Amino acid sequence: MKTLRTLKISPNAPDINSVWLYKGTMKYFNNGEWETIG
Amino acid sequence: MVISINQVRQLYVAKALKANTAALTTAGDIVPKADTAKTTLYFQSMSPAGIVASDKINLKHVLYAKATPSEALAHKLVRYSVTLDADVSATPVAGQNYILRLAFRQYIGLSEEDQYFKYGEVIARSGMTASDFYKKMAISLAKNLENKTESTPLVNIYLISAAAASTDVPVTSATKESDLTATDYNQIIIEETEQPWVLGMMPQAFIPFTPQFLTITVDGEDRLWGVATVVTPTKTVPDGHLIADLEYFCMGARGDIYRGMGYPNIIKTTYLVDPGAVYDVLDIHYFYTGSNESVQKSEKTITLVAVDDGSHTAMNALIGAINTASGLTIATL
């Protein structure tokens, strides 16, 4: 239900309503953390 | 040039140093003349037209007498070492316009409110090393600055192959990529240039500059792509063109102020300064004071010049003579 509709490329984390792209890793705010993806 | 005077300044060239008034045959000979009492001092000079003598110096009214070396009067050409800052990236970033802006403050005018901006551009590609980037940037800088079309010289671009960190590989709008066969280029030196000079109408000026960089998106953030740092200069502009305009000005005190003005009705002054040589200088400041109510001083400047062989042999013997003659103890630079 928590639907994200933005992605942000940056070296510092963006707002939690977006995904976090940084040089080979993407991260989304899950369980009060930025959960990487494998 | 025009200078500020402390009520007067005279110049005398010392081409050859003699020991007598009788040996003055050639137009640059000079003698420091004083009496055993060490109460006055004057110089007997050989002019294009006969002997002349300078105003007499009262050796009790000398304010200062210091000989400057030729090195002191050579304008050092400030040079930067331009690189790309390893914090943004140690290598070019493809698809980004690596622009470089060079600002010029004292452009044709003489104020700091008369600025001029010339640019250098390089768009990076994958597999582009740093040497390739510097090559391409120096080339784009030359084509815009060291061209056969710009009214004035602005900069001297160079390249340095890290294998030889001393030699400054030059670059001009004629230079082409293939003429630069090295792969260890690590900086783009940018040095100010000697501007054109003509005796008595165009003072020896320089156009100072600062390299301003621009932004590039590296990981989503607009960041500056390079760092410009000044390094100890290595090319100096001698004083030949400077002493020469000094003479041109200080010879209209002894002589004609109507220089070339009414062209055929003129007094043509013959000058002894070579604008392709390197002179030391010896300036002596003194004054005249009157009698019992005219105690006001009249400070008057007199300066002497002499070519430099690298060891200041001409001026050293010159003042050694003046010291044997006047008791003064000027220092032999």
From Swiss-Prot, chain A:
The record's subcellular locations are: Virion
Q: What is this protein called?
A: Head fiber trimeric protein
> At the top level of its lineage, which domain of life is listed?
Viruses
Q: How does it assemble?
A: Homotrimer. Interacts with the major capsid protein.
| Function in brief | Forms short fibers at the surface of the viral capsid.
Curated annotation (Swiss-Prot), chain B:
Residue ranges, annotated region (FD): 75-237
Q: Has keyword Ribonucleoprotein?
A: no
Q: Where in the cell is it found?
A: Virion
Q: Which UniProt keywords apply?
A: Capsid decoration protein, Capsid protein, Virion
Q: Which GO terms describe its cellular component?
A: viral capsid, decoration
Q: How does it assemble?
A: Interacts (via FD region) with the major capsid protein.
Q: What is known of its domains?
A: The central region FD is structurally similar to Helicobacter pylori flagellar cap protein FliD.
Put simply, this protein is called Auxiliary capsid protein
Q: Which organism is it from?
A: Bacteroides phage crAss001
Q: What is the lineage of its organism?
A: Viruses, Duplodnaviria, Heunggongvirae, Uroviricota, Caudoviricetes
